[PDB]
Amino acid sequence: MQIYTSEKRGSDTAGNGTEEAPLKTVLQAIVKLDGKIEADTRIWVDGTGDEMWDVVSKSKLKKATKQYHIQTKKQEKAPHEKIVSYENGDNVNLSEAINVQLTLDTKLPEAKELHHHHHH
């Protein structure tokens, strides 16, 4: 499953995730899969100049995965155009993903010691 995106073009209305209809941002490529980016999932970007389509950076893609899951990811979700695709998402949460809530570490959210001295 290949998804083409044109961030420099920023095609929202013309953004489907294909070649003739490239998405505006990588975010819209994930909203359809709910973060289900597997080996068959290949997202292409504007390119490097030499090529028409290049691979999306994992650093940016992973960040977008987090952002999308917090912003667009609600309780429910609908499928998409490419073969519909069922709710084939992961979660697990048996005795390992519990450390994400009951983290035995000293961290304070929204604190920002000397970092809050210049913004929220």
DSSP-assigned letter for residue 57: P
Confirm if 23 and 15 have CB atoms less than 8 A apart: yes
Confirm if 66 and 24 have CB atoms less than 8 A apart: no
Torsion sign over Cα 19, 20, 25, 30:
negative
Q: Coil, helix or strand for 42?
A: strand
Phi-psi region of 45 (alpha: psi -120 to 50; beta: other; left: phi over 0): beta
